[PDB]
Amino acid sequence: GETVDGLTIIDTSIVWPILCQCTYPLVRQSGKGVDAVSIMEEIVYPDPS
Amino acid sequence: YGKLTLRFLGTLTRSLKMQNAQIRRIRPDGTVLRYDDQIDIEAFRWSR
Amino acid sequence: KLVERQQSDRRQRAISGLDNDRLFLSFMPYTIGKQIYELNDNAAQGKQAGNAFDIGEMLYWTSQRNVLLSSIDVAGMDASVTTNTKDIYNTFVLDVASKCTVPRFGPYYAKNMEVFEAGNRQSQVRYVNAAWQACALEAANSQTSTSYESEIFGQVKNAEGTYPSGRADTSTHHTVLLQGLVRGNELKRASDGKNSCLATIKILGDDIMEIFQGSESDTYDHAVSNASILNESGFATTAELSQNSIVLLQQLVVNGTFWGFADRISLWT
Amino acid sequence: KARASEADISSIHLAIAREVSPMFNVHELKKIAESFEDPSSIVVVLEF
Amino acid sequence: ANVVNERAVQDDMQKATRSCTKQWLRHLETQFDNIAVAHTDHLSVVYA
Amino acid sequence: VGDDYLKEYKKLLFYGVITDAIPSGISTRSTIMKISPHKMMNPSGGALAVLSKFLEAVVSTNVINATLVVYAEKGAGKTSFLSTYAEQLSLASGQVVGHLSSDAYGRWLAKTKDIEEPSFAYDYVLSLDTDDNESYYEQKASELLMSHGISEVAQYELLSVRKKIKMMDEMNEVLIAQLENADTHSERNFYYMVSTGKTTPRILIVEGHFNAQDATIARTDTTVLLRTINDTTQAMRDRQRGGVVQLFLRDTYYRLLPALHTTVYPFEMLESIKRWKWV
Amino acid sequence: AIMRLFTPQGFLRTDDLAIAANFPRASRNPQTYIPYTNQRGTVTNEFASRFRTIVATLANVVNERAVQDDMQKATRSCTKQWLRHLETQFDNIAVAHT
Amino acid sequence: QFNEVIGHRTKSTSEPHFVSSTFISLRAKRAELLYPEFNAYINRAIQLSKTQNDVANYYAACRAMTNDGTFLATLTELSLDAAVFPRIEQHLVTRPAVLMSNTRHESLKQKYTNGVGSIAQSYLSSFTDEIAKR
Amino acid sequence: AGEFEFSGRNEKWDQSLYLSEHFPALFSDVPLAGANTIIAIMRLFTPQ
Amino acid sequence: VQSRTDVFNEQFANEALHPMTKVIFNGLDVNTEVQPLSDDFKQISDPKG
Amino acid sequence: LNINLRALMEANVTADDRIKALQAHSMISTQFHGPNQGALRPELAFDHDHIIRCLMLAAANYPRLEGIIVQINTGYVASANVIRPVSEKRYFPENLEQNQSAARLVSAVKARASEADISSIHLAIAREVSPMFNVHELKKIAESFED
RNA sequence: UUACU
């Protein structure tokens, strides 16, 4: 029960913001989003360092 | 209307090589068919 | 001619009362920049609610975790818009009007103009519609100065290059612009390997108000670039941000509570 | 009401004239983003 | 009308939503009869 | 037929339109191919009336110190042009006009960078420029071209756009240091006190190179944009002590001067004097 | 049959770039679990079509339940309008997940 | 999401490390630009405040000390310099590559090249294909 | 020889394929044994 | 000899279209650096017994 | 001083095998090039038997180590620009919240929907590949299954 | 004596 400030408590809500109120990079085309048409994303590849 | 027409098109011509330019049908694959006597018009046989 | 109107706490401010024909050239940039409002939420709220729905956005994100909130006024946003900064709205109003087909609009008609095509020598006649013609003329022609007849002096005239804020598009030209600069930042930051980490942003020009999320270091790396690109756009953003503090349309929201600003309603002036 | 659009005089005259015009640039469709989710989505099929 | 009939009754929607759909499908019937007299007499001589 | 471009150059500048997309590319070594009589072209009802505001504010005794602001490129050849348009307006108005000759900030600030109280008088400004005093920006530009080491015009062609454009961005930051505040050596103080102080003429004509000098020139409702019969970058390889310093700054100023004002076409200002009804 | 709907749609991916990097792993074969497959070059989405056949079961469980409590056609059809509204919002975002 | 109150939590307002550096610069300007009794009323509200409700008590009350609601009216020749004079804060904004121009050399179609505007048209130019149907 | 060679793949159409040897397969007007509903809807797109 | 792209009025319009990024670099384009995986050994010069 | 040298030279791995530690901590099918320093720049191999043996003492004596590992994994997700929140709600289709007969439904969607925190969505994604040192447990969903 | 959203 040693919680790590909200780590072990799993909230299975958290599929409703994933399903609705989030914009994704590969959803912002077509889209389908708050783009509101088609615009761009230029996918970010994060650095290893 | 001529110069206006002439202007409209209106500046690029020097891309196509015009060495022995003929008018031939192609296959939808992309090979140039020969002159077929019974499909093409008479004026496409020898582009004079 | 310079109309003057004053507010509760701002200094004595002037705005330009345009006649019907100078109002006419600004109208097609007003109608083009109007339809971005229905398209993008974040081109945002008009104040029809009166009650809690004008703040029901700001009451929610302040109630959340790991958020820093910035609320930006640029300082003076009539001045700053030089003619060159004004041009960023002019491309958007042009580039809509070419793909469109508007016949006649007013005292125009879709006709056959001589158009120079850069990297062509020689004029080649495109077909332009009336929206195109009108917008080009208005964009070209723009006189900005306000001229006030004085009882002291003869006729004092403002040195132009401001934004003559009465034209038609005085609410869209500062909305469509700042929407392009802050949202366009998270394309440019995504273009070179940095994340975006910005949630919903509400722009009623000039009042910018964006909402960030992540660690306390990630959001700040974005919060500087939203300042620094507005700093390099020729704008004096004043400076405001905080964790749990947010303002928009002179209505403070904090901690999930609503603070009033009671003194702005002067009962007796 | 989402599909139907105001009857601009300029493009009804264009769609008639495109029918017997020669096609040189290959035409392409406006990107219709519909779902075909509800049984009210037959309006797109009646459009076609 | 029979295609939208099967899709409405497979997914058990209202009696009124199926009726107000089919009342719309025959409002396009009335409007098509009123203008086909003008298409097939005056548009068709222009395409000729 | 087939005389050069410098023979009767003065009449062609006063009355010509080079109907070609800029860069047209005519030069002082260019000759004539053919001549045919053509219709007298008609001036610009949208650009006649903007210039007609200044030709009303010069007339009325109401408006104190009207001002005409003329933007062009660095090689449009307007200091040789609007020196005689002062001579066409003052003889028609019966007043005294004087053009500030467009570089008189740059010639003057090089002379007194150092001086705590400078002389803002009108007679001191005009007895200073054209040409022997170097401009201040041509000192700054001159130092800058060196740092990305370059001294030849043909070497400037070898440089290309984004590697060039970063040099232009570096060139700007010495611009804004004279535009931002109203210090005692800034641009805003110079075009104010020259325009106010009683020794000056009633209706000066300033000329600006780059746009967003509009917050500095003062004060007017009439800013025009001059497009002469001159491929201006050809005239900067002409200039005949041009070098790269003249040609870098035309390029820098074209990056700061778009056509967001009324193009004015130098025969139309000579046309509007004539139309106006005088006393 | 309802507990068959909880099965994952993924694959057991081996850690090839961890062993060659000689990184520490607390098992013999390091086999982490990816939740869903990559979906290039396809018209339909094989992960978003799994959710089509789950709601095709769940809109029949809620339909067999609501007719047993003989409730309204209006209160039941508006539920089934929402169950296929999850279909439209799943087909949009499963392109970015997979 | 749908603005009803669902919970209460205790969330600790300590503004982060980089705005604590803006406190040192601002409190020096608080000391000299203000009347010292108005300043001493403020410095008690920093120190005495114990709840989030308590800062709200002082803030609306310190706000009405800086305003009288009087609309600030003079003759507008005095405020022409202050209000609508154009300022250039620091940078110049550069111009577009003009692609098309009509018979007079003026902007007809134009595109941005690596500026501040090119950041803006990276977002905005996507809408020109849809708004042209609205 | 005049046969129809169906591809057997599930591809999104593009107008690049309009100049090639591929056709849209909804408009084959060939009755598939087991798909007599989709083909019957495609008999409504015939011209008149 | 220039026609006509060396003039900046036509060069600036042909760089908004297809903006050039890549330059000729006949070496190896270093963009990242790597730290050692374990600072394990000290590197003294004259050892003491 | 000879044991420390006979491990640094006979391990036969170089500084060029630091690249294999970069192909793991970056995206799949990335490509690295150069510099090919060769055997003039040697290095120990990454000690496999020791680190996995001391992560099992660190997991036993320090059960907060899951907070270290997840914070690294959360920091990769938020730096990847992979899922970002937004203000627009589309939980319901066009005119269903306004519909009267579905008021029993929308009072359970909003009621569920309202709590889960954002950006615990950013956190969770880091739970689908972290180690487990504390046993996770469910946030109490007290329901009745009546309607 | 007086602007637009």
Ligand SMILES: O=c1ccn([C@@H]2O[C@H](COP(=O)(O)OP(=O)(O)OP(=O)(O)O)[C@@H](O)[C@H]2O)c(=O)[nH]1
């Ligand atoms: O009557 C009004 C009032 C306000 N506005 C609005 O004013 C905006 C420009 O005004 P600013 O909002 O930029 O003024 P400022 O904040 O920089 O001034 P300070 O607070 O710093 O003192 C414009 O973008 C516009 O939309 C009007 O157009 N008309």
Ligand SMILES: [Mg+2]
């Ligand atoms: Mg403001």
Ligand SMILES: [Mg+2]
């Ligand atoms: Mg404001």
